Design a protein around this ligand. Sequence first.
Ligand SMILES: *[C@@H]1O[C@H](CO)[C@@H](O[C@@H]2O[C@H](CO)[C@@H](O)[C@H](O)[C@H]2NC(C)=O)[C@H](O)[C@H]1NC(C)=O
Ligand SMILES: *[C@@H]1O[C@H](CO)[C@@H](O[C@@H]2O[C@H](CO)[C@@H](O)[C@H](O)[C@H]2NC(C)=O)[C@H](O)[C@H]1NC(C)=O
Lengths: 49, 66
Amino acid sequence: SGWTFGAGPALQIPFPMQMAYRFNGIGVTQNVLYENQKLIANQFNSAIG
Amino acid sequence: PAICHDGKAHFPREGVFVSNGTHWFVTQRNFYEPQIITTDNTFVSGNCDVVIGIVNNTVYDPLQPE
Ligand SMILES: *[C@@H]1O[C@H](CO)[C@@H](O[C@@H]2O[C@H](CO)[C@@H](O)[C@H](O)[C@H]2NC(C)=O)[C@H](O)[C@H]1NC(C)=O
Ligand SMILES: *[C@@H]1O[C@H](CO)[C@@H](O[C@@H]2O[C@H](CO)[C@@H](O)[C@H](O)[C@H]2NC(C)=O)[C@H](O)[C@H]1NC(C)=O
């Protein structure tokens, strides 16, 4: 759900959308994430590993 | 995540795309209000190949009829 559940009910929202929203939060716009989703996933998995 | 009108991904400038089953709309994040998906509320950047989960639907140009 992202942040929504910290405010009221847990509004279900798929992770891609949640991350695109987070990117738009910091002035990057959704197109960056939806054109690099595989790269972001690889970087996140590598960092968490 | 995006709408492909003609080989071009249309991401929402503000809000997330929603569909009432059959017709897709743009609405805010913390309140539901459907608006027709025009070029005003969406900005195009891409090639409709890399984004995953994109649906086709259609967009309405408010300038072509006039
Ligand atoms: C989703 O909403 C749209 C409205 O944007 C529905 O399309 C019809 O739109 C006309 C506009 O002239 C209305 O008069 C109709 O009442 C709308 N139909 C309905 C069933 O409300 C569209 O049908 C809606 N889809 C669903 C599955 O409810
Ligand atoms: C959405 O529009 C695209 C636009 O290209 C279409 O994709 C077609 O997919 C078939 C099946 O592989 C191909 O043979 C065609 O060449 C593609 N293009 C066209 C213009 O038909 C299709 O209309 C829609 N596809 C989806 C997945 O919604």
